[PDB]
Amino acid sequence: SSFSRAPQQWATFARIWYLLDGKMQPPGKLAAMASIRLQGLHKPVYHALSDCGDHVVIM
Amino acid sequence: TARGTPSRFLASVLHNGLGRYVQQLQRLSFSVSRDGASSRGAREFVEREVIDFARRNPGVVIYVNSRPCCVPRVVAEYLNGAVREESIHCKSVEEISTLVQKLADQSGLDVIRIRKPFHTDNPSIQGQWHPFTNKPTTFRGLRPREVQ
Amino acid sequence: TYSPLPDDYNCNVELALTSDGRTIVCYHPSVDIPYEHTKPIPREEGPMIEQLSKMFFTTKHRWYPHGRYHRCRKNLNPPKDR
Amino acid sequence: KFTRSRIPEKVFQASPEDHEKYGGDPQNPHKLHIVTRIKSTRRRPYWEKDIIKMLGLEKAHTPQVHKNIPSVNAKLKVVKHLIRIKPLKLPQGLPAEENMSNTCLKSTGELVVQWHLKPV
Amino acid sequence: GGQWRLQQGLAANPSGYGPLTELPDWSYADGRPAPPMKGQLRRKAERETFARRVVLLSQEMDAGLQAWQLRQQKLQEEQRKQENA
Amino acid sequence: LRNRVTDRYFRIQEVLKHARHFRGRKNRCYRLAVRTVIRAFVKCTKARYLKKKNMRTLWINRITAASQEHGLKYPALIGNLVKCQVELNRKVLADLAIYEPKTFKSLAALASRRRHEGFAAALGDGKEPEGIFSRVVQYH
Amino acid sequence: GYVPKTSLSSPPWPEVVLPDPVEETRHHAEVVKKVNEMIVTGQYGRLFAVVHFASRQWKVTSEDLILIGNELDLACGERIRLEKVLLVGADNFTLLGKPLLGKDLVRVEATVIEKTESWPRIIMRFRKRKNFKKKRIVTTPQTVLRINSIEIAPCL
Amino acid sequence: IPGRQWIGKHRRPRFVSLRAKQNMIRRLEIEAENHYWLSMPYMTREQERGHAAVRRREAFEAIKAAATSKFPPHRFIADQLDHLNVTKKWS
Ligand SMILES: [Mg+2]
């Protein structure tokens, strides 16, 4: 808390980069983990209009 | 509908409930015909209950104009400069006494669609969620797949 | 020894019932980031829409303009909150 | 054809195993049912749409005291698939005219005759 | 989750009976009690006519048992007051 | 024509004031406007049942998002906040997760303590004394 | 009754040991006394409350506004003590009832600012090919509360 | 499916999940309890005879007396003369 208006808004809706190792993993259990993180469905600030998806990097 | 009509947020005028409650009507203005059946109830409102009303709230200054009109109007002016002109045409005395008490209770803000049913100005106390709450910190700030 | 959540990231949660058993008192002071868990501060329309799509990771479609109908339907004085 | 259904008397003769599963007494049985409709009268024949009006069960999930007599029970045997029957148990007695305005019917089926909203 | 509330004896809906929806929502700041809610006056009136129905239907059984307990005795002394002369 | 309609202009503007923000000729031509202004009003009242549906689906997706941050699933949080008689609804629980994440971390700690008290009561069948957070408060 | 270590022999969740209930109530007395001392000395700052007003639950802080969709038969300006507080929280502690906090502990005040009506809000019915078309415009009455203070008292 | 998926000779098959099996089973257990509580009446059929005939007969008499009291309402001179008030003026 105690932020200004503009850096508080930036911190909440910032996009985060997730790594996700795909070695010996099924591709559908990686797809469920990625498409939650790609939608923003892991954030409590989630809305379908707020455009709060993150970046998932699968190796 | 709501996509046709404007909208606003739930507010008050000058934080109307924090220190004291300021009555938000300034004026009521009645045009009431002396001869006319359309202002039959409006003549009985002035005769009976406008003197009981003008003592129940001494901040409202009431003007009864009494000119030959076909439609009697009531022109409620508020503290934020808004004007809500309504008609009391062919209304009984019990129907003007609630129409005027409705004009006293409300503020001068528009009766357009209110977006949220609440208004917090400090919505967060423990600090609003950002992605780095509920995420533990690694040693030395090392991101994944970083050796040094 | 027991902790219902791994009190490591957000705050140190301690749950407690009062002696009547009617209110639940939760005590949670904020955890601080340690000093050793930080880093020191280190000290044409076609090609331009391909350049911003690579820059902001959006598609090409949101950089093309819109007509006069959508441009003047927009509320340029929108209601503000908070 | 599709007719009304005569259910035999064998179905409504409770076994001594049944007195152990549900907490009823064969000798000294309960006096008042608590009837509650839990299925719709739509897609049901007209002889069940009218019995439900006779017992007052037009609203779903609204309880209704009915006597445990073999004439009320003949109407409950028609629409037993629509309703849920439980005994009205009375821990304290039936309410007097002083305790009439402080009653509450609980979800266990019991009618408490003193209902404060304070904990124990 | 209302199949747990039915085991504790509460209403399956938390909006049923209990302290949440039967206590007064507000009071005056000086401490005078509020006039009762229209949904509490309507519920207490609907609970009274339910309890009046428990009192009415239980007495109609108990008075109906005593009438059969007298008619089966009046049938009985009719059998014994003809067995003479 | 003894009495023909003199005020037909204002009956058209009763409909055409609702159509001003449409597309095509639905904003101008009255014959095309009433079949859409009526249809814009039926959708306005049929979407009072979908606002309450789409808000609760949003609250469930914002509680499920925040309970996963503490390792809880959504049915493991709602199901065990009821068992502690904490009758918070979905609107506040989705607005506790955004604006007060320390209090939401305490509700995820409480719903996981009651969950572990539910398993330990279930593996130890037979009469065992109840858990500490599993004791119900009775009202009479 | 021993099973060797395969993958399915043991359950996959970690075996959680629940702590002893005689030492937990002693630990619960330490946590309750810690938070109670924060109420006496004034360690808290801004409080928020979750109040079960009319039919729903409002997350409520001080100096805010609430819009309820019914007339409250009050005068504009009358201070109102909202009962049924069911969660009170600060930056460092929260108290949450079962299901309500006591009236001895919290006191949430509220004024009444305005008693408006809603915006004119249409109800239109239509069925195709049936000449079924109804229109109705309702304005539900509304009231606006301004929460003045969420006081807390050391009764724990 | 040849025509109209759910009617006719060849329909598309519908199958019973664990939802639909458990939904019928917990409705079958409300029903088995219903057969229990209807199996033990408080009175036999000869004891209940006429036990509420005095209340049933008085119930109909109050419907019958409400039916035979349908008549026009009273017409007052203070409803006819109050229409003179539409031209009530000031002076
Ligand atoms: Mg076909």
Side-chain angles (χ1 to χ4, degrees):
Chain A
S1 201
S2 316
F3 296 161
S4 300
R5 292 287 175 169
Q8 173 60 80
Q9 201 275 333
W10 189 257
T12 296
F13 288 104
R15 44 190 55 162
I16 303 297
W17 290 66
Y18 298 97
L19 189 56
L20 195 142
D21 201 56
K23 178 154 206 218
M24 288 294 285
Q25 303 303 294
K29 276 172 154 58
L30 305 194
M33 291 187 69
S35 91
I36 279 178
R37 262 88 186 179
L38 279 182
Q39 283 166 83
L41 261 177
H42 60 284
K43 310 193 176 180
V45 301
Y46 171 66
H47 206 276
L49 281 182
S50 290
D51 182 69
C52 46
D54 289 357
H55 288 262
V56 193
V57 177
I58 307 186
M59 53 186 286
Chain B
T1 54
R3 284 174 86 114
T5 318
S7 63
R8 70 179 175 104
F9 277 105
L10 179 74
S12 48
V13 194
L14 278 191
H15 317 86
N16 203 26
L18 269 182
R20 53 186 57 177
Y21 169 68
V22 174
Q23 169 78 274
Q24 285 294 314
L25 260 182
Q26 302 195 31
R27 279 169 297 272
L28 285 169
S29 291
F30 292 89
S31 279
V32 160
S33 164
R34 173 194 84 198
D35 302 329
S38 85
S39 47
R40 176 187 38 168
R43 281 191 301 266
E44 293 188 23
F45 177 75
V46 173
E47 219 174 326
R48 285 192 189 99
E49 309 139 359
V50 83
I51 312 176
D52 311 287
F53 180 72
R55 291 182 192 141
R56 273 178 291 185
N57 36 14
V60 194
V61 45
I62 305 173
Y63 300 92
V64 186
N65 202 349
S66 197
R67 46 184 213 154
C69 59
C70 293
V71 175
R73 256 67 161 259
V74 54
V75 192
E77 315 205 281
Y78 291 92
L79 261 178
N80 47 335
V83 187
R84 310 274 92 97
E85 169 202 277
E86 293 307 321
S87 84
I88 47 178
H89 163 84
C90 267
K91 263 153 190 174
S92 67
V93 201
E94 307 93 51
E95 291 323 301
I96 308 170
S97 307
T98 78
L99 192 149
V100 167
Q101 202 46 246
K102 190 208 75 204
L103 288 177
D105 292 333
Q106 70 190 15
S107 48
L109 312 160
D110 316 77
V111 206
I112 56 184
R113 170 181 78 95
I114 292 165
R115 291 210 188 197
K116 285 175 197 208
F118 48 85
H119 172 227
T120 54
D121 220 334
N122 304 87
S124 196
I125 290 103
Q126 310 167 350
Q128 158 184 324
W129 185 91
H130 48 85
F132 283 134
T133 61
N134 307 334
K135 265 181 208 160
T137 313
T138 42
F139 175 73
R140 225 194 279 273
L142 304 194
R143 54 175 89 95
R145 261 66 164 164
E146 190 197 271
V147 52
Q148 178 88 321
Chain C
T1 307
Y2 176 74
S3 85
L5 293 183
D7 47 1
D8 191 25
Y9 38 81
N10 190 18
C11 64
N12 296 308
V13 178
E14 288 178 350
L15 312 160
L17 285 172
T18 57
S19 89
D20 49 23
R22 287 165 196 173
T23 85
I24 311 179
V25 173
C26 304
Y27 176 56
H28 48 67
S30 180
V31 73
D32 315 329
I33 298 148
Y35 181 80
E36 66 269 4
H37 282 205
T38 74
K39 260 164 179 165
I41 275 175
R43 292 176 171 188
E44 293 306 296
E45 169 150 49
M48 176 258 283
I49 287 178
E50 192 64 79
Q51 193 251 332
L52 297 152
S53 88
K54 260 195 298 299
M55 189 177 180
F56 294 112
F57 303 95
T58 82
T59 42
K60 75 186 176 198
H61 302 106
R62 67 158 315 282
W63 309 98
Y64 295 110
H66 281 257
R68 201 224 172 262
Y69 182 67
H70 291 286
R71 267 187 285 132
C72 315
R73 272 191 62 162
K74 175 182 313 196
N75 210 8
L76 297 152
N77 202 40
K80 51 213 62 175
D81 186 26
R82 229 156 80 222
Chain D
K1 296 160 195 64
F2 174 60
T3 62
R4 314 188 190 187
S5 199
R6 284 183 297 106
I7 298 105
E9 173 73 323
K10 189 262 180 184
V11 190
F12 298 97
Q13 281 157 7
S15 42
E17 190 69 7
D18 273 6
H19 302 313
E20 190 185 3
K21 181 176 186 175
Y22 319 105
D25 287 332
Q27 281 213 298
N28 208 45
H30 67 290
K31 300 171 75 170
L32 300 168
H33 289 314
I34 303 175
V35 196
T36 308
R37 191 174 57 77
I38 57 169
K39 192 69 79 70
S40 183
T41 45
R42 304 226 48 76
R43 302 161 192 275
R44 283 296 114 193
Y46 70 98
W47 59 80
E48 304 188 10
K49 297 210 208 77
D50 285 294
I51 288 287
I52 290 290
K53 274 150 69 79
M54 290 162 194
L55 305 154
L57 315 162
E58 294 142 306
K59 285 195 78 65
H61 316 314
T62 284
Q64 188 83 244
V65 162
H66 279 305
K67 307 156 146 162
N68 192 16
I69 46 175
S71 41
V72 172
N73 279 185
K75 284 162 188 48
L76 296 186
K77 281 174 197 179
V78 182
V79 290
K80 45 174 191 208
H81 45 277
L82 301 195
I83 61 185
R84 162 190 291 148
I85 289 153
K86 264 180 211 149
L88 175 65
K89 49 181 73 174
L90 289 85
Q92 305 103 57
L94 55 87
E97 307 273 8
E98 296 89 7
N99 257 320
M100 204 62 102
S101 159
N102 260 325
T103 56
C104 191
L105 177 84
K106 285 194 156 160
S107 66
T108 54
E110 69 205 18
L111 185 82
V112 299
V113 303
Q114 51 92 29
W115 180 243
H116 331 278
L117 303 147
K118 294 180 52 56
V120 306
Chain E
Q3 215 57 50
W4 173 87
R5 298 195 188 86
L6 285 163
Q7 301 180 172
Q8 317 306 290
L10 306 156
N13 205 313
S15 280
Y17 56 89
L20 265 168
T21 73
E22 302 210 8
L23 286 186
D25 279 332
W26 59 272
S27 157
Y28 288 89
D30 315 318
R32 331 196 293 277
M37 298 295 170
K38 333 275 198 173
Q40 186 72 22
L41 295 189
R42 190 200 32 85
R43 207 170 321 124
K44 285 193 67 177
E46 278 212 301
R47 280 195 192 128
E48 190 157 17
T49 71
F50 181 82
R52 290 255 145 80
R53 204 181 140 87
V54 184
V55 171
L56 168 69
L57 291 197
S58 197
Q59 290 169 350
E60 263 183 25
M61 303 262 259
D62 303 341
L65 279 168
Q66 283 187 354
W68 181 83
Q69 278 184 16
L70 289 178
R71 282 191 320 262
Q72 288 330 290
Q73 266 170 359
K74 286 186 295 138
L75 169 143
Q76 265 183 28
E77 289 104 13
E78 185 88 23
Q79 302 284 150
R80 291 175 37 212
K81 289 178 183 177
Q82 197 181 3
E83 288 317 306
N84 308 317
Chain F
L1 303 171
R2 209 195 154 277
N3 40 1
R4 44 166 178 163
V5 189
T6 71
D7 63 301
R8 208 174 322 188
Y9 174 78
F10 306 101
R11 291 179 204 157
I12 303 286
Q13 303 290 132
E14 170 206 29
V15 175
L16 285 201
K17 81 188 168 188
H18 301 305
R20 301 286 98 182
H21 60 98
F22 282 14
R23 265 198 73 157
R25 328 206 282 284
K26 318 170 186 86
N27 49 5
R28 309 181 282 266
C29 306
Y30 176 82
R31 174 191 288 261
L32 317 171
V34 196
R35 312 205 212 103
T36 329
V37 167
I38 286 169
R39 201 157 150 86
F41 286 172
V42 183
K43 287 182 199 312
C44 173
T45 83
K46 266 177 163 183
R48 305 198 185 130
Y49 296 96
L50 282 152
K51 187 174 186 175
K52 318 166 169 34
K53 180 178 199 171
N54 291 331
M55 281 300 293
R56 183 157 154 158
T57 307
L58 172 81
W59 297 331
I60 283 168
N61 286 353
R62 284 170 159 184
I63 290 160
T64 319
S67 314
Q68 281 300 134
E69 284 167 2
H70 317 298
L72 280 178
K73 296 188 181 172
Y74 175 80
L77 177 94
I78 290 297
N80 300 105
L81 278 188
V82 171
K83 291 171 183 172
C84 303
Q85 306 174 334
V86 185
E87 312 271 17
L88 289 152
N89 56 340
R90 272 75 164 179
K91 183 172 107 188
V92 181
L93 265 183
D95 289 10
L96 278 176
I98 306 170
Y99 283 102
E100 266 101 337
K102 297 198 215 147
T103 306
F104 197 82
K105 204 200 166 192
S106 304
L107 289 169
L110 190 137
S112 38
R113 169 71 181 271
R114 181 53 181 85
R115 211 209 182 209
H116 294 328
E117 287 183 345
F119 295 134
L123 304 173
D125 272 300
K127 274 304 309 184
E128 200 96 4
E130 313 264 7
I132 298 195
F133 288 87
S134 312
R135 304 207 186 92
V136 304
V137 188
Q138 281 300 321
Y139 287 84
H140 76 285
Chain G
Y2 162 64
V3 196
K5 182 61 59 195
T6 71
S7 80
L8 283 173
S9 70
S10 51
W13 49 82
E15 308 314 304
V16 189
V17 289
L18 276 179
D20 272 318
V22 64
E23 324 176 323
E24 181 96 15
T25 64
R26 157 181 316 127
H27 172 56
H28 283 346
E30 295 170 21
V31 181
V32 159
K33 188 200 152 189
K34 254 179 209 146
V35 166
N36 199 8
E37 283 191 29
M38 299 171 49
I39 308 174
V40 188
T41 68
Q43 292 285 97
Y44 58 91
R46 190 145 206 151
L47 309 179
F48 71 100
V50 181
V51 188
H52 184 285
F53 208 52
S55 178
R56 55 192 57 88
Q57 294 170 24
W58 313 87
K59 200 257 183 177
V60 160
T61 184
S62 164
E63 319 167 0
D64 77 326
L65 292 165
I66 293 302
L67 168 86
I68 313 103
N70 68 325
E71 279 177 349
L72 270 188
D73 53 63
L74 289 164
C76 279
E78 264 173 22
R79 299 185 49 114
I80 287 313
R81 179 191 200 260
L82 308 175
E83 271 94 2
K84 301 198 221 163
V85 192
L86 56 91
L87 186 134
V88 166
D91 204 358
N92 287 158
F93 65 98
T94 198
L95 321 176
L96 58 96
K98 285 188 154 214
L100 308 166
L101 292 171
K103 283 185 221 197
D104 50 27
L105 201 152
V106 201
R107 180 170 177 95
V108 173
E109 298 285 315
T111 33
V112 185
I113 297 187
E114 67 192 77
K115 309 171 80 188
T116 55
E117 284 183 342
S118 90
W119 64 296
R121 160 176 285 275
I122 323 160
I123 301 156
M124 167 92 76
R125 258 50 168 263
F126 186 84
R127 294 171 186 175
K128 37 182 152 183
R129 292 165 266 114
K130 285 307 175 292
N131 201 37
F132 183 80
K133 167 173 47 193
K134 311 173 152 203
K135 187 183 170 163
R136 180 193 178 192
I137 296 162
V138 289
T139 62
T140 77
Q142 284 166 356
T143 186
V144 166
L145 297 196
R146 150 82 44 84
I147 283 95
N148 286 97
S149 49
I150 308 183
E151 279 163 327
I152 195 169
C155 316
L156 284 175
Chain H
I1 313 109
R4 200 72 207 213
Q5 327 171 47
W6 297 113
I7 80 178
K9 192 190 218 179
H10 308 309
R11 320 182 182 188
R12 77 184 276 246
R14 173 133 166 80
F15 301 108
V16 192
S17 41
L18 271 172
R19 261 183 188 157
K21 279 180 205 189
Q22 283 154 6
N23 284 2
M24 182 159 275
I25 281 165
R26 72 170 64 95
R27 263 179 277 129
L28 271 161
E29 293 162 357
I30 308 168
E31 188 71 21
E33 198 189 344
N34 279 13
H35 292 81
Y36 179 69
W37 297 117
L38 297 164
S39 63
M40 31 179 61
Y42 199 56
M43 306 175 148
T44 75
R45 206 172 265 275
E46 41 177 291
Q47 318 177 345
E48 69 149 359
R49 175 140 323 176
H51 88 278
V54 61
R55 193 251 305 158
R56 281 186 60 248
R57 216 187 42 234
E58 287 201 333
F60 181 51
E61 277 177 6
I63 310 164
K64 162 198 297 196
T68 78
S69 158
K70 220 156 62 198
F71 217 69
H74 312 273
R75 305 179 62 88
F76 303 95
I77 198 75
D79 290 333
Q80 201 211 29
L81 293 176
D82 273 343
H83 201 82
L84 285 188
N85 285 315
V86 302
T87 60
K88 169 200 282 170
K89 271 76 174 173
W90 271 350
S91 315

